[PDB]
Design a protein around this ligand. Structure first.
Ligand SMILES: O=C(N[C@H]1C[C@H](Oc2ccccc2)CC[C@H]1C(=O)O)c1cccc(Cl)c1
Length: 135
């Protein structure tokens, strides 16, 4: 039983980052965490089992893992240790991840573009783009 979200499945390694420090400032991440998180070169491991999608990240900074069903809110601990309420949906082929905490919101979009997985993170008007390639 294939699904469209199978284009995301696999092991991905970070190959470029743009404006991540500024995005983290807008989110409210402190200096020391920004510096060490910004240095990280995570791998992201995406898998699907039935209706459950898992996204795991492994890095020298932190390892994180989320499992979820599309459209069903869950509580998430982020790499920077926010406790957030998250919902992830598929909108036209893009995984759209909204995180809410403390009256604030940020959106992380994940899309396949050529052989890359492109992650766009937006907090108010600030966008960071993080590009992954297959490991
Ligand atoms: O989950 C991680 N990355 C994702 C979600 C991040 O959210 C953050 C917001 C503020 C501070 C840090 C992260 C935004 C960037 C995303 C990406 O895919 O690159 C991740 C996991 C382990 C280590 C590290 Cl450095 C990042």
């Amino acid at each position: 039983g294939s699904h469209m979200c199978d284009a995301f499945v696999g092991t991905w390694k970070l190959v470029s980052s743009e404006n991540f420090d500024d995005y983290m400032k807008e989110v409210g991440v402190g200096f020391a965490t920004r510096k060490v998180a910004g240095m990280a070169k995570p791998n992201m491991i995406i898998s699907v089992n039935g209706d459950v999608i898992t996204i795991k990240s492994e890095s020298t900074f932190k390892n994180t893992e989320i499992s979820f069903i599309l459209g069903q809110e869950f509580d998430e601990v982020t790499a920077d240790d926010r406790k957030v309420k998250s919902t992830i949906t598929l909108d036209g082929g893009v995984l759209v991840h909204v995180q809410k905490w403390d009256g604030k919101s940020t959106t992380i979009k994940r899309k396949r573009e050529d052989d890359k997985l492109v992650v766009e993170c937006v907090m108010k008007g600030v966008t960071s783009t993080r590009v992954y390639e297959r490991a």
